[PDB]
Structures are given as C-alpha cells and as structure tokens.
C-alpha cells in the first residue's frame, strides 16, 4: 500500500548512507551492494530486537527517524518481486542461522514466516561449526542458482558463533533492447585521466530516457529490462574532471531525494543514443559488521544485545552479517549473447531499480575493471 513506499524510501536512503560509509574507506575500488537484500535481511533481525538494540537498527535502516508498517511493506515488496509472471529473477538468500541451544519463540517463528517467508534455522555452532558452515554455504548456493558458493569462509564460523545473518542475491534479467554480440569489441576504459584499461565494450544505436543535468556536470540514462519492470540507471560525469575517477563531485553531492528526482524527472526525455556500455560481472562480498557499527548499529553486536523477540533470555548477539551480490552487465542483460553520444568509458554510478515501487535493488560505483 503506502506501507511499501516507506520501505522503498528507507532503502534508497539506506543506500546512500551505506555508500557513503564505504566510499570514505576505499576511494579507488568498486563499490557494489544490494541495499534491498541487506535491508530486507536485517529486517529479519530487527523483527527479533528489543529496546535500543531494535532502535539503532530502525534508525540506520531508516525504519524510523527517532515497526508494523515496515514489516508490512517488506512483505508486499517481497510478494511483488517474487510474482510468477515477472520478467526478471531475484534469487535471494536471506536467512538467520542461530545456535541449536537457543530456545526460539514460537510467535517470532510465525511472524517471521508471515512477512518474510523466512525462518531462523538451528545449527550446532558450538561443537560443529564447519558442518554448520558447509550447511549454510550449501543453502546459499542452492538459493542463488549455484552462482554464490562459499559465502562464509572458515574464519567466519567458530565454536563462539551464535548468530549468522546471511544475505546473498543473484540477479537474472533481460534487456528491453539488447546489444548485438557482433558489435561488442575491445576498447579502453579510462580509470584516471592518465591511466586506462581495456574492457569488452558493448554498443548499440537506440532510443532511451536521458536526463541532461548541465548545472551538475553529468548525464543519466535509463536502460529498461523487459517490459520496463526493472531498469538500470547510469550516471556519467560529463567527463573526467578530477584528480581520480571524475565522480568526486557526484559523490560529494549524492542524495536520495536528488537520485529519485532525476530518475523520474519530467526533464528526462526519449533520446536516440550512441551507447557504449562495458561488460562487467560484479560479485562483491561484504562482511557488514564494522560497517554497520560505524553507521550507528552498536548494541546488536555486543553482549548487551537484546533479541528477546526470538529468544527467552538476553544472551543472543549478532556474530556475522555477510552480504554478497552477483550482477552481470552483458549483451542480453545478465547473460551474454550467442544522435547524442553516450560513451561509458569512465567511472560511473549506477543502480537497478524496481520501477513501480521505486525500490533500489542494486547500487554501486563502477570505476575500476576487476578483470
């Protein structure tokens, strides 16, 4: 209803903040994550949190400024994203793994099942961390169509471990207008002004929604997936006018109010585009603990955690929050194939949105070819 506009708003907001915490750390590497996967998975743990443990989560996740409405909107976004006739696949693997000796509460089990069609699993961390680890990595792999194995490493599961919030996601979708295999060729992608790197550069001449933000020195394109249910927006700085990537201005002015304003700007108009879009497969994996504690989520990770929404006693803390998303940008879309100049050969911000509800599913900055 409107219950799901809040969840979408909180995500887009969560997105930028999460980007900003990461960006200040590493200014020279690719930043890519699924804010929907991350947020929807912490919602599982927020559901089980009490007091300021619960409050710190709701505040960083943007569920409140200073509950029911949030879980309700999440359910209906999860319901919408998992329709059968959808022209796109979100192979999502959100689950919390709790130690076998913790007495879980029935109410939490039926509330978790209702809003998320997900429920807490009991593994023996205490005397069999590896059997638990392999069991989790196997589930995460079977949920993400084999695309994400070994989510948790050996150093992530110990006899200590009490709770693991895994959250992975594999993206499958096809372009509305897809590139032609024969027109993909090797071309330089400019990292800096001075340094560049070759990449398989895809190309097509076709019409797309394009916004020309002259005052802010960039241009943005909308590349719809099939039926335009999902789209990927790409924000290109007019050029590299920086000591590094060329995005230093966009990041120093990044905002969600702005982001969404440009996304649906009536000033965005159909345009015939000479489009050059590099192939890339991003499989970023992030251990979110410290990153979340930096964003304001402290208590959930301490001995003072209060997750008595799921357990009877105040002895449960989050141990690991491990995220990983796999997204490819290829000729057909997520898979490979068998007049305004829009040449993407310099660092760019991008995001895959679910158009109807305006939920950002993926967001990142591509600057730095992994190959």
UniProtKB/Swiss-Prot annotation:
Its main location: nucleus. It comes from the Eukaryota. Keywords: Chromatin regulator, Chromosome, DNA condensation, DNA-binding, Nucleus, Protease inhibitor. Gene3D superfamilies: Alpha-1-antitrypsin, domain 1, Antithrombin, subunit I, domain 2. GO terms for cellular component: chromatin; extracellular space; nucleoplasm. It is found in: Nucleus; Chromosome. Detected in all major blood cell types. Highly expressed in granulocytes (at protein level). One of its GO terms (molecular function) is serine-type endopeptidase inhibitor activity. One of its GO terms (biological process) is nucleate erythrocyte maturation. SUPFAM superfamilies: Serpins. Homodimer and homooligomer. Interaction with DNA promotes oligomerization. Belongs to the serpin family. Ov-serpin subfamily. DNA-binding protein that promotes DNA condensation into transcriptionally inactive heterochromatin in terminally differentiated avian blood cells. Promotes tight packing of nucleosomes into spherical clusters by binding to linker DNA and subsequent oligomerization. Acts as a cysteine protease inhibitor towards CTSL (cathepsin L1) and CTSV (cathepsin L2), but does not inhibit serine proteases. This is Heterochromatin-associated protein MENT. The gene is SERPINB10.
